[PDB]
Amino acid sequence: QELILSEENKTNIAVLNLGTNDRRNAVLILETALHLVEKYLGKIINTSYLYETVPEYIVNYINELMQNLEESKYEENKELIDKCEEYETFLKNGKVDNSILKEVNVENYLLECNNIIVKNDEIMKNSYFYNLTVVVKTFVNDPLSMLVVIKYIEELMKIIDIDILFFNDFTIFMKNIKLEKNMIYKILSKYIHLEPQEIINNMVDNIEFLSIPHVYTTHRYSILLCLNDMIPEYKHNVLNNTIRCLYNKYVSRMKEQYNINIKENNKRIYVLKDRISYLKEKTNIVGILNVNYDSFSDGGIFVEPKRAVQRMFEMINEGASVIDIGGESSGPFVIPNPKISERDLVVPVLQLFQKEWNDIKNKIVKCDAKPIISIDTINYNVFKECVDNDLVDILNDISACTNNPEIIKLLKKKNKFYSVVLMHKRGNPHTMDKLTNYDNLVYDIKNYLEQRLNFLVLNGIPRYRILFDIGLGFAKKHDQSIKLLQNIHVYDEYPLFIGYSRKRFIAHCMNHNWMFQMNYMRKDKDQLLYQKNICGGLAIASYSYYKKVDLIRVHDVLETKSVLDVLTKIDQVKDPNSSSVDKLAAALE
Amino acid sequence: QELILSEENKTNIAVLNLGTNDRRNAVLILETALHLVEKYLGKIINTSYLYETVPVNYINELMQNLEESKYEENKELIDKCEEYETFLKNGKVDNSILKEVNVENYLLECNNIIVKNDEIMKSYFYNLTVVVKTFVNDPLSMLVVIKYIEELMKIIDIDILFFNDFTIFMKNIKLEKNMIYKILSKYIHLEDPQEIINNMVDNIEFLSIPHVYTTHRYSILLCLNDMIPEYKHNVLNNTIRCLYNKYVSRMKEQYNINIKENNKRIYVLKDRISYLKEKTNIVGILNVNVEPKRAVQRMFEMINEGASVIDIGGESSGPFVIPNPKISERDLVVPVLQLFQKEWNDIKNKIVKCDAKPIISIDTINYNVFKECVDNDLVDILNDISACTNNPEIIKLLKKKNKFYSVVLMHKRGNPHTMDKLTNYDNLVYDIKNYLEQRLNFLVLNGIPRYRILFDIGLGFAKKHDQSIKLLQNIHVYDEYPLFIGYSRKRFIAHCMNDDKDQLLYQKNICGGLAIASYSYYKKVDLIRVHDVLETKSVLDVLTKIDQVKD
Numbered sequence A: 001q002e003l004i005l006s007e008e009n010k011t012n013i014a015v016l017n018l019g020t021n022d023r024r025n026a027v028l029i030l031e032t033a034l035h036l037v038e039k040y041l042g043k044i045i046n047t048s049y050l051y052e053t054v055p056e057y058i059v060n061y062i063n064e065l066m067q068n069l070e071e072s073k074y075e076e077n078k079e080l081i082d083k084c085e086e087y088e089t090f091l092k093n094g095k096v097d098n099s100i101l102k103e104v105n106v107e108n109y110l111l112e113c114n115n116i117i118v119k120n121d122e123i124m125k126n127s128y129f130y131n132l133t134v135v136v137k138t139f140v141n142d143p144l145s146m147l148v149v150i151k152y153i154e155e156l157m158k159i160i161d162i163d164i165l166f167f168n169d170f171t172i173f174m175k176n177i178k179l180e181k182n183m184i185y186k187i188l189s190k191y192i193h194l195e196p197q198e199i200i201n202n203m204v205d206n207i208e209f210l211s212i213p214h215v216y217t218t219h220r221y222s223i224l225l226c227l228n229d230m231i232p233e234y235k236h237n238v239l240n241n242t243i244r245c246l247y248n249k250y251v252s253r254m255k256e257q258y259n260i261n262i263k264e265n266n267k268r269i270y271v272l273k274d275r276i277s278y279l280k281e282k283t284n285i286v287g288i289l290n291v292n293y294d295s296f297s298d299g300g301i302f303v304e305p306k307r308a309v310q311r312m313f314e315m316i317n318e319g320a321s322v323i324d325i326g327g328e329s330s331g332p333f334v335i336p337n338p339k340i341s342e343r344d345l346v347v348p349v350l351q352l353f354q355k356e357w358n359d360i361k362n363k364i365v366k367c368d369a370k371p372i373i374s375i376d377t378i379n380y381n382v383f384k385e386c387v388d389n390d391l392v393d394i395l396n397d398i399s400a401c402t403n404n405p406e407i408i409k410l411l412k413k414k415n416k417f418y419s420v421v422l423m424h425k426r427g428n429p430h431t432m433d434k435l436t437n438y439d440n441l442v443y444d445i446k447n448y449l450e451q452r453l454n455f456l457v458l459n460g461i462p463r464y465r466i467l468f469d470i471g472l473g474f475a476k477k478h479d480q481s482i483k484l485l486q487n488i489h490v491y492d493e494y495p496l497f498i499g500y501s502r503k504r505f506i507a508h509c510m511n512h513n514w515m516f517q518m519n520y521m522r523k524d525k526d527q528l529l530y531q532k533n534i535c536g537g538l539a540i541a542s543y544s545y546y547k548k549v550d551l552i553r554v555h556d557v558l559e560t561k562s563v564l565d566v567l568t569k570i571d572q573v574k575d576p577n578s579s580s581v582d583k584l585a586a587a588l589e
Numbered sequence B: 001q002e003l004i005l006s007e008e009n010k011t012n013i014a015v016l017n018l019g020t021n022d023r024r025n026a027v028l029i030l031e032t033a034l035h036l037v038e039k040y041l042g043k044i045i046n047t048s049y050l051y052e053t054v055p056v057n058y059i060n061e062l063m064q065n066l067e068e069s070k071y072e073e074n075k076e077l078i079d080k081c082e083e084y085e086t087f088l089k090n091g092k093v094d095n096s097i098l099k100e101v102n103v104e105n106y107l108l109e110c111n112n113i114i115v116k117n118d119e120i121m122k123s124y125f126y127n128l129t130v131v132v133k134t135f136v137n138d139p140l141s142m143l144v145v146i147k148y149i150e151e152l153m154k155i156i157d158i159d160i161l162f163f164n165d166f167t168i169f170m171k172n173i174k175l176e177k178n179m180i181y182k183i184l185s186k187y188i189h190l191e192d193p194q195e196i197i198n199n200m201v202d203n204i205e206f207l208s209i210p211h212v213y214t215t216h217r218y219s220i221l222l223c224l225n226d227m228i229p230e231y232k233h234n235v236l237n238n239t240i241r242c243l244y245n246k247y248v249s250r251m252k253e254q255y256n257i258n259i260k261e262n263n264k265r266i267y268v269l270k271d272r273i274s275y276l277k278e279k280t281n282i283v284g285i286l287n288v289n290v291e292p293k294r295a296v297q298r299m300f301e302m303i304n305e306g307a308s309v310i311d312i313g314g315e316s317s318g319p320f321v322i323p324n325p326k327i328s329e330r331d332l333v334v335p336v337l338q339l340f341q342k343e344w345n346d347i348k349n350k351i352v353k354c355d356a357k358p359i360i361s362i363d364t365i366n367y368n369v370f371k372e373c374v375d376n377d378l379v380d381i382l383n384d385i386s387a388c389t390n391n392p393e394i395i396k397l398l399k400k401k402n403k404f405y406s407v408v409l410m411h412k413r414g415n416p417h418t419m420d421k422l423t424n425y426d427n428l429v430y431d432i433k434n435y436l437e438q439r440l441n442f443l444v445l446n447g448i449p450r451y452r453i454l455f456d457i458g459l460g461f462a463k464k465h466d467q468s469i470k471l472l473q474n475i476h477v478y479d480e481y482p483l484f485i486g487y488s489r490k491r492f493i494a495h496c497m498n499d500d501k502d503q504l505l506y507q508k509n510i511c512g513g514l515a516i517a518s519y520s521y522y523k524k525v526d527l528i529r530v531h532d533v534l535e536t537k538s539v540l541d542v543l544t545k546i547d548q549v550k551d
């Protein structure tokens, strides 16, 4: 009552659940809440994947809302961290200050939660969910104050359900709560510069009780599923075991006891731009536009932006979902044009593309056929000018953001998040072919990428926006490139982006309507070799399709799309039991 | 003492096992034996696959100087064999001229031979069974003739597994060398023979029918299961199929050994062993419908691009195709094939590439065309898109005195103009499969080796696009059979796609076919018939490389 509003500069760890039932807008809704959490509550230092969830039993006013928000009373800083001691403390069970709110014991907690569960069960006797967890390092003093601010956040969004799953190591159950409008105003005022009055009203009745941990933490698969991504090793006093063990037990008991595969209807989601993609449900084509190549393979000396943009339109028409544009070549032994800059190679092209795209009259005819744009850069300044001018959706960083970790701050704005490809390499175009010694090739690269994701996620990059790339041909011998492909299954839990297109390791596999469009006249021998190389990669397209690789980065968009279209058709069975049924019918003659 | 040489012309049914241990020449050796069986013993009316089982050129001369049989060789096609049906049931047959033993005695004497052998014992075998409708009076006469065949071949083991419904165990067989001569002379115009008979005198110690090991060797049951799965001899507990099954299940549940792992089914394209399901072979298409010289360099191009087989045709069978009144099928294909043979032989210079010779396949349904091909040794394979139903007489051309040819049997209905309308099937996948099986049964009854017959579902031929796809989706129904498919550049590919502008459609088609090549690789299709050989080879090499695990 008293210590709730004391001016003690406190640092706490809370774990939240963010849920919505609105599919079309699931991303916008949940990311808006992420922003409001970052703004009003503290620092997001962990996230789970996004998930489409089936429950246990079985407009654009946000835009304007974001423009006119009350400033926080706390400093926002986008600075990078490589660790967070209070988080470390929370994950172990290190000594933390005693709860200012009154705690219950374990047994009393479990009885109160069970009561809520049986009570909600009963009421029910008389939709898809979209879910994400977050860990917040928070300046709010207690879960009751936090819930008040969360209730404010919900109301601001005018559809969204934000729950507190954990708050430090506290065990709390507060049975009856009637906060006067007076009290709400004072909690809010401690954290927000308040203007605005119509909101506090709805809030009064909304907080009936407080349960920490949340009543449903152990009961809802969808929560265990999300927590398992973030904090698998966490054990709270109330819990029988670690998050991971509880998660695994839930899965195997649904199998053993009810004959259900609980994974079937609880789908991991990743995000490329602003829409839901179901992990492993589609192999997307990323069409390659290398401006250097496109311009100077000629033997020419001038960039040709119009030719560049034409090519971008061609690849869209050929069925690319993403275009990857770059102006810094990174293939073996390539010296760049040292006279024209990366920025001048790509930005004009992207600017012209934006202009041509916009020169289209549509209101319901053709509005969402826009390709996602990826920029192959490691360069902060280039990426910054692109996002400032809305030229791109995705950072493709072949250094996994180690060239300049600050580029990571650019993947976040007040209202926008951007997705990012992290790739493994060693060395540069001139050195990489000799940097080939690995203790454990497959796991070294996996562990490297996971460490990078952990770093991005610590810095509040949403987990579902980070894609992995093993970097074929980049400090790998041909046999190693193959081995990475043979062992691609190790990425079955992750959004996977690969680039094999026209690389040397394909030719190493080998013992006419030409698919290589010659830039200069080639010999017959070489045309054949190019043909084999492009066809060799269509083999990897097939392999990728069957391995459920999420994105493939290719020069030959029409060819690749033709392959994926036929594999998709063969896979779409009209009736999934017809083969046994037809067989039995034939035996019965 | 001579009821054996009785002139009562009889028709019996015998089941033989042919075995060799020479892998490199297994086909030549076993097929040599088949020829000699057809010549000396009667008519082959059933064969198993060839199998590799875990337990040189004087032949060419031999085949040129054989003594004639005294019995006739009739080639007319048959559709039924009464004696065989009698044998498949345990129908009533004439009493054995050799004295029979009962089950108990047989089982006792067999067990005696096995145990005596188990302790004597304390490389791969190539095996094949055949059913022979035989003019030989009795199993002992047959063994005499068989030992002669083995001696002629100078390497080969030929056993009598069954002979009618007889149960026989004869212990201490001594045959005077004059009696062996007399038996031989009853079936063969003996014209060297006389320093061969003396070898034989040692050989026949005893005669067991069924053969001692019939029910005890997996390799035997494996072959018999192909031919006569439902057959139950008096002296056996269960039918062939049950004995086979209860040997696979025993070996799994008693040893954790998959017996199928070491025992490989074989098919033959030309003259070498192919392990079923172990390679996706490329068949390059040559449509001569094209000037001979050009056609032939195209053939050489395709070999160099990695085609195992070249399929030449001079009759288009694609939809609504306009025929050529100007030049006959014969005049299109035969000169090309003649020039190829000549051009290939002129590369006798590069003697080191004498085994790089492609298998040649002719896409025809026309007896006259095929007859000219085989007479002039221009081809190895008949690709008959009618499954040999258009003119069944062509089946007679798949055999010579010292040669067998392989055949692709394809399913279709109607003709190029009507096929698009003949699209109603009660059970598309099983109708086509059953049809191909019926065709195979007809050829096998007619003495075509089972292991030389390839199945083809006929994509695009009396199938709507979705039906073509459905066949592909359900290609696993051919897991037991050598499978040949042709998808290359067919309309159904374009139908999969989402939606020099014709060269756009053309490229999509080629690329869509490369997807089917990938699918086929993984489904272990034995042969794929394609236009774009370099492209297909590139796909297969990469997929193969990915499958190959190193250290």
Ligand SMILES: Nc1ncnc2c1ncn2[C@@H]1O[C@H](COP(=O)(O)OP(=O)(O)OP(=O)(O)O)[C@@H](O)[C@H]1O
Pocket (backbone or CB within 6 Å): A147, A161, A162, A163, A164, A165, A206, A207, A208, A209, A210, A211, A212, A213, A214, A215, A216
């Ligand atoms: N940890 C918690 N987080 C959020 N609400 C909580 C918590 N503990 C108790 N509550 C209470 O539960 C209610 C939250 O209602 P909400 O609209 O989020 O959906 P619900 O399904 O009814 O509740 P819950 O959040 O318990 O699942 C409020 O009355 C709130 O006081």
Ligand SMILES: Nc1ncnc2c1ncn2[C@@H]1O[C@H](COP(=O)(O)OP(=O)(O)OP(=O)(O)O)[C@@H](O)[C@H]1O
Pocket (backbone or CB within 6 Å): B143, B157, B158, B159, B160, B161, B203, B204, B205, B206, B207, B208, B209, B210, B211, B212, B213
């Ligand atoms: N049904 C039969 N077929 C072949 N040989 C038989 C048969 N019954 C008995 N035999 C005898 O077995 C001999 C076969 O010896 P072979 O050189 O084939 O080696 P094996 O495998 O030890 O013999 P078997 O074929 O009897 O198992 C014949 O010469 C004959 O004495």
Ligand SMILES: Nc1nc(O)c2nc(CNc3ccc(C(=O)O)cc3)cnc2n1
Pocket (backbone or CB within 6 Å): A330, A331, A332, A376, A396, A397, A398, A421, A423, A469, A471, A472, A473, A474, A497, A498, A499, A500, A502, A503, A504, A505, A553
């Ligand atoms: N995310 C991502 N993933 C790639 O795989 C990639 N590749 C290139 C091109 N770089 C190479 C590297 C190696 C080779 C060879 O060995 O042939 C060729 C080209 C550029 N951007 C890329 N971006």
Ligand SMILES: Nc1nc(O)c2nc(CNc3ccc(C(=O)O)cc3)cnc2n1
Pocket (backbone or CB within 6 Å): B317, B318, B319, B363, B383, B384, B385, B408, B410, B456, B458, B459, B460, B461, B484, B485, B486, B487, B489, B490, B491, B492, B529
């Ligand atoms: N064994 C065999 N197997 C084939 O599949 C095949 N196809 C053709 C060519 N025939 C067609 C049929 C249909 C289509 C279409 O729908 O486009 C095109 C060509 C010729 N010989 C063939 N021989």
Ligand SMILES: [Ca+2]
Pocket (backbone or CB within 6 Å): A037, A038, A039, A040, A041, A042, A043, A044, A075, A076, A077
């Ligand atoms: Ca913040």
Ligand SMILES: [Ca+2]
Pocket (backbone or CB within 6 Å): B037, B038, B039, B041, B042, B043, B044, B072, B073, B074
């Ligand atoms: Ca005969």
Ligand SMILES: [Mg+2]
Pocket (backbone or CB within 6 Å): A161, A162, A163
């Ligand atoms: Mg709630």
Ligand SMILES: [Mg+2]
Pocket (backbone or CB within 6 Å): A515, A516, A517, A555, A556, A557, A559
């Ligand atoms: Mg191309």
Ligand SMILES: [Mg+2]
Pocket (backbone or CB within 6 Å): B157, B158, B159
């Ligand atoms: Mg023997």
